[PDB]
Write a protein that binds this DNA or RNA. Sequence first.
RNA 1: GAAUGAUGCCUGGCUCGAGACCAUUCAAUCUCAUGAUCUCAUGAUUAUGAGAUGUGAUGAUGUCGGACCAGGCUUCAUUCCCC
Length: 1137
Amino acid sequence: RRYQLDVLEQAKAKNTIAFLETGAGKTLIAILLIKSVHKDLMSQNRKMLSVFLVPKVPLVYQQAEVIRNQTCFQVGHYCGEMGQDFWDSRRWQREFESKQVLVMTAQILLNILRHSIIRMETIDLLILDECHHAVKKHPYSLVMSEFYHTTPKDKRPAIFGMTASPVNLKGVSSQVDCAIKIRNLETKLDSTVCTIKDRKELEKHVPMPSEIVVEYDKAATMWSLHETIKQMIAAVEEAAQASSGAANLIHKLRAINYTLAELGQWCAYKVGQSFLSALQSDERVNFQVDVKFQESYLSEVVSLLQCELLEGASLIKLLLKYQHTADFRAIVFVERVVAALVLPKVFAELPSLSFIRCASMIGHNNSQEMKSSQMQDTISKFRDGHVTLLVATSVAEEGLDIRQCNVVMRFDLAKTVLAYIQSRGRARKPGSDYILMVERGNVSHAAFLRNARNSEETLRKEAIERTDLSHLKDTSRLISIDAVPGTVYKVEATGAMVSLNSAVGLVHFYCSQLPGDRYAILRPEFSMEKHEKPGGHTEYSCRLQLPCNAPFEILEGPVCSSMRLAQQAVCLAACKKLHEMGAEVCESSKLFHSEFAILFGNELDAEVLSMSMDLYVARAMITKASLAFKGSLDITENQLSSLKKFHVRLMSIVLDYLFVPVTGINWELVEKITKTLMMADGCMVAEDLIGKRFYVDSICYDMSAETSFPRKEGYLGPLEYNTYADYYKQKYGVDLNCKQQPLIKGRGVSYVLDKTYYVFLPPELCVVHPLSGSLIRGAQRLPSIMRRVESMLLAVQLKNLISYPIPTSKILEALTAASCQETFCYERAELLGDAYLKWVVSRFLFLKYPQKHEGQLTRMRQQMVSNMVLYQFALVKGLQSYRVLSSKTLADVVEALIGVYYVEGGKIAANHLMKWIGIDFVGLERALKYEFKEKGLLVEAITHASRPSSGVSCYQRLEFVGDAVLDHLITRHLFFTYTSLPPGRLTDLRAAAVNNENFARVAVKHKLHLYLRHGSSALEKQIREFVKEVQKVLGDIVESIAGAIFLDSGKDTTAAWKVFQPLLQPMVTPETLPMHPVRELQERCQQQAEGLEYKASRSGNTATVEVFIDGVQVGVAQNPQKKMAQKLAARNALAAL
RNA sequence: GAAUGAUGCCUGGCUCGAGACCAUUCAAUCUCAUGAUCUCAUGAUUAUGAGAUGUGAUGAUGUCGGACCAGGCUUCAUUCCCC
């Protein structure tokens, strides 16, 4: 109607406070105005960004309904209550595209006010409710404190709020006139009030039900001696207090008192029955024993009283007049929720009319209630008509769409009569009447009804515009507006309050450090001391205790007059501290055992060249050597050009810088082969090659071409070619001119001697291809030598290193890829380089930060041990010059370089290449069988992330460094271990090295769980289990000792290395791998590996698995179902087979 | 010209089993409270939000082996060949 348009004018005009109950859908008109300013292309098109802020999340689901019900212009929502620490950044980055309206609660938006995000998020527009609550304790006031100065482009110029839904500010005697606290709040949020001005724009279609009072209950309440009974049971409770979760049961007693008081004793019997159900659940779940004792105490007292009140077993006729054609919509309003829970039982019980309830969400430790979703389910059931008859009953009572409820029954709710007027607008009145069953007993409800009357008086008073606004000027300052001025003056107050809130939240955040032993550890804590100074100068010593990771924040100070203010001041100390912290070619000849020779401009260096190199074939080894007799021997380059054409002819058509067999060079042979009836001669074919190419070792004259093709096998009857000239005639149509010549014993050059002797060739029927078979040997043996040559020229480039103690003859093996060309791998020096990598990165890292954080510098190490960084060190070298899919083992080759260049000289030259590319006490002492000097680092190692009431330091850093050092040390041993196993088996042994369990096994070789001091007893209980296993944190404190002696040794490994190695060694050669079962099973049944499901049941055995080749056995243990079930199955199988 | 088997190696994806680590989910925990009510007041009582921790499993991802098929190369036996 019209008043919507009027407040459209007033609100689009200026910042606006409206005070109208239901506003005829105030949020509707808010949506309309926001769509108006949206369709308007604003100055900044995203500055609009208006959110209706509520804290009520089922109401947020109503806004899901609403904001998808409207706003073709795009809008968003939250589930809320989610992990959104940095999520909000990309939430902005996506909301600027796709979410003009996003929904969130207040406190999240408060954290968004923190850290000075971009520019107050370009908001400039807002909708808000619960604005009456926006007071000193409330967040919204603290928002408007920093938002009072709407300076930057006026980031928050116009303000729109809703105080209509909660009108119970408290103070009708202080606010009999129209504006008292209203002036105060409208000066707070800087938004102008607009009142309803009249009821002419209301009540035309907004009827208000007449209020009907009742006297005393239709409850019986006819047992007054049970009041004295409950007074004696109150004395029982006083004994329970003098004893001192007892208080919850105490309040349960108070509750059942209220039930028996207000609704008779039969109802309190039903309440005792619900107490039996709740108390049965209490006796079930509760493991605490004093409280379970008092649960049994509850059962005896409640069985006494409730069994009396079963023999003892309101407003009913009110319900009954409304029962004929039951109410389409019914609302009942009471506070005590457990009574509301016990109603439908009684209502099915005596009058046989079904009833339903809506619970509240506040509860503790799996409290039986409707969840928020379950409340929405109940609401949807209420949207169904049958459950609407069942009735709706709650205590939250806000933000639902329930219309035209004929019966209003605020049964004994009078604290928020103004909120009831909310619930009165909730329903349009079709001749409906509100009903107020108040007991005629206890007449202070006369006072409550005149308070209601004064409430409508004050509503009528504010309905007159400015009835106490422009009226009081000085007396308003003597009433409350000098008590409520623009108090924003104190600048350290807002820094102090922000420091309070943020420092407690950051206390929580740094409490989320990494406890490990327990899910939550109380690392920050405090105690309070009344530091009242005689004279009225009360002070408060706030004693502040911190974790070890918090260095310099312990404060025990009578710093401020109030206790919470002293905590605010210690938060100020903390916030300052976290501002700080957190915030003529050389002739050289080749010999082997016309000899060969290379021709290159380069002169081979004697040291760089291997003295002899080896060759390995199926027959035998052949080794070779070279010698530079004539330095700069000169041959004519044109003859070189012709014979080079012949050399590439050898490569190209014969084999299909340059090598030479030298007799004194046999140039004439080179040129001869450059160009290149009858009787046979055996001497010409004593060593030859015959082009179609075959080897000619020897002949046979006894077998001639006229003789038969001997085929010993006669099953299929293969064609025995009666002459070999007839064999040639049958296949190629060829006959020999003189078939009497001997037959060539054939020898095959292609890539048991009887099959070789099978081939027989005719001399003329073959065009010789001219080479001696020994030179055939040499020529086909040339290519591996060329691979050797390219190896030694790479050795020319690389033996020419930056620095090199020894020649890089084994770097030749390091350069070659693992398992490539049958040659050796590089993995010993590789894993050695990896171990040194970890050791030296720990070295330089602690060189950087002895002020480090442990896991943070762990992240920094992992950053340094990122493969791509070492890939870039390779790039700034370029071992490429001696196609990477970005996932390559080239980093491992670099590691090989690192290890081998340690091996060539010292560690130090290896570090040069790195810079070239990259950059109880005596009891546990004798338990380790050792001696110790500085017990401070020992204390540092024994300190645990949990320590009983004491904190000095942490062992996590020492664990880190001893970890890296023993990586180095174990790797150094294992590559001093010259077993030279399969690299798979080398991988197995290094993996067997890395296991915290066997480090804990060393710890119980010294039994340090008896020696460790620790705050947590459940952690010791977990350790005592693991000790009973052997007759987790133990290996960790072992590494802390390792690091501690690394400090003691001045970063030396050898001294404590000597101590650890004998106890280290003798277990390693037995494999005894705990991943026997699944590895050995999936490998022992490659063809048929089948599997049965386990995770259906918890701890226990279920191992009738469908494996076939190994067989099917079941093995028994306490918890084998994770691992060792298949191991016990293999045990029973090998017992079976 | 080739192939067959057996023979080990290596590569791809797929899968199963352990590490690590990321997200989800539901419970829970602990703070932070905020309104109202008595209490001169403290204090007590009642309604309702924020997180963070978080149990389990889920989905991943990154290492590490399995198998599995798909393949490249080679020995040990032959069959066959090429003038």
